[PDB]
Structure 1
Amino acid sequence: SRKKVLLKVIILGDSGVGKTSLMNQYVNKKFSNQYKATIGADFLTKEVMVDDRLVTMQIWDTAGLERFQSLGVAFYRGADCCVLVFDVTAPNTFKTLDSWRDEFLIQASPRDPENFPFVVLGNKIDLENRQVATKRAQAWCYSKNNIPYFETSAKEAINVEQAFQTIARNALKQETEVELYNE
């Protein structure tokens, strides 16, 4: 039918922030209050339209809990984009953002590091409590290499579809995407 390609997204962030919940919300439009610590690293795939192009996104969910961050087995190499996710109500998860983005670059080590797609999701905004300010997070994202930032709510699906849309477009606008099966 039409041309197809694949992108590889690596979602990172401290244990708790909502990475697993953000991914499920996007991929299966489902959520659950019942937590379930993610160990190791796993992934999903979803296909959506991206300007007459049919892109299949390989979304990797990772472990935020240090005592499970086992493998790390360069399953990062593909990564056409990296999603830095934190808990808006939990300030530390925002503090350590540099830990992750850095860590990513060191592992992945993508050509043209100063332009690699990064999307920052400020999760759980659906809670009254809130220790990190949008402006703050904003001031930070731009401050990097003007990477987009989205306040999200894996729970009430705020900007989940929207976040991944941009996640899809920046990774794609980087020419790194792999073709699929089109003889």
Structure 2
Amino acid sequence: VLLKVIILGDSGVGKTSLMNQYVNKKFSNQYKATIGADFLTKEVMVDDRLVTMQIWDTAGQERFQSLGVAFYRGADCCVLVFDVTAPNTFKTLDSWRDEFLIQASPRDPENFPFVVLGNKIDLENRQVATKRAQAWCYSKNNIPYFETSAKEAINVEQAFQTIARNALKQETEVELYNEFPEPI
């Protein structure tokens, strides 16, 4: 069982840092723009079951985005990341959510698993309030929200445990749908 997870969000919010903290327990203050989309794989235990997570890191800069997007299809979970110190990055979440739905075209979009990460909470200059972020998540059919720090490894393991569990649930349903579709 391979679980495909896609991480989306504006340039600089910490997508690559979150993935590298989780997969490699390493963090760099140095910024290196992500070009295109590619993945790291990690074997993880999901509620006592072994699965391989294919975690796709993507370019936040539009000029660096891959032209091809076939990889979104079949995705099991989409991670939306914003920077709590940068309100513009929280305001683009609907566009990211919509781009994911359009490229992945999942059946039953309202129940597709999304997980939102408000990153860089270690910084002193926060501008996006937890209540405002939670209100948005609730309005998107109650998606899970975690405040993280990739720099200080705060809530990273916890967020990815829910990402893995929800992605497994989704993979499980798609497989069931293919073999036993429910009637109309």
Measured against aligned partners, the alpha-carbon deviations of 1:56-107 in whole angstroms (never above 9, x if no partner) come to 1000000000111133422101210000001110000000000000010011
Q: Taking structure 1 as reference, are residues 56 and 177 closer, same or farther at Cα in structure 2, changes over 3 Å only?
A: farther
Q: Taking structure 1 as reference, are residues 77 and 157 closer, same or farther at Cα in structure 2, changes over 3 Å only?
A: same
- Single out whichever of 124-133 and 72-81 deviates more from structure 2: 72-81
- Return the TM-score normalized by structure 2: 0.92
- RMSD of the alignment, in Å? 2.7
Unaligned regions of 5+ residues in structure 1, if any? none
User: 1:177 maps to which residue?
Assistant: 173
| 1:169 positional shift | 0.8
| 1:175 positional shift | 3.7
Unaligned regions of 5+ residues in structure 2, if any? 179-184
Counterpart contact for 1:82–1:118, Cα < 8 Å: yes
User: 1:129 maps to which residue?
Assistant: 125
Q: Taking structure 1 as reference, are residues 20 and 135 closer, same or farther at Cα in structure 2, changes over 3 Å only?
A: same
Name the count of aligned residue pairs: 178
- Paired with 1:37 and 1:173, the residues of 2 have a C-alpha distance of 32
Measured against aligned partners, the alpha-carbon deviations of 1:15-71 in whole angstroms (never above 9, x if no partner) come to 000000000000001100011000111110001111231011000000000111133
- Return the TM-score normalized by structure 1: 0.92
Measured against aligned partners, the alpha-carbon deviations of 1:122-143 in whole angstroms (never above 9, x if no partner) come to 0000000011001110111011
Q: Taking structure 1 as reference, are residues 52 and 181 closer, same or farther at Cα in structure 2, changes over 3 Å only?
A: farther
| 1:170 positional shift | 0.9
Counterpart contact for 1:16–1:64, Cα < 8 Å: yes
- Paired with 2:126 and 2:163, the residues of 1 have a C-alpha distance of 25
Counterpart contact for 1:17–1:93, Cα < 8 Å: yes
| 1:181 positional shift | 21
Counterpart contact for 1:23–1:61, Cα < 8 Å: yes
- Paired with 2:175 and 2:47, the residues of 1 have a C-alpha distance of 15
Counterpart contact for 1:82–1:117, Cα < 8 Å: yes
Say which structure is richer in helix. 2
Q: Taking structure 1 as reference, are residues 181 and 114 closer, same or farther at Cα in structure 2, changes over 3 Å only?
A: closer
| 1:10 positional shift | 0.3
- Paired with 2:156 and 2:22, the residues of 1 have a C-alpha distance of 6
Whether 2:140 is the aligned partner of 1:147: answer no
Q: Give the fraction of aligned pairs with identical amino acids, expressed as a percent.
A: 99
Counterpart contact for 1:6–1:180, Cα < 8 Å: no
Whether 2:72 is the aligned partner of 1:76: answer yes
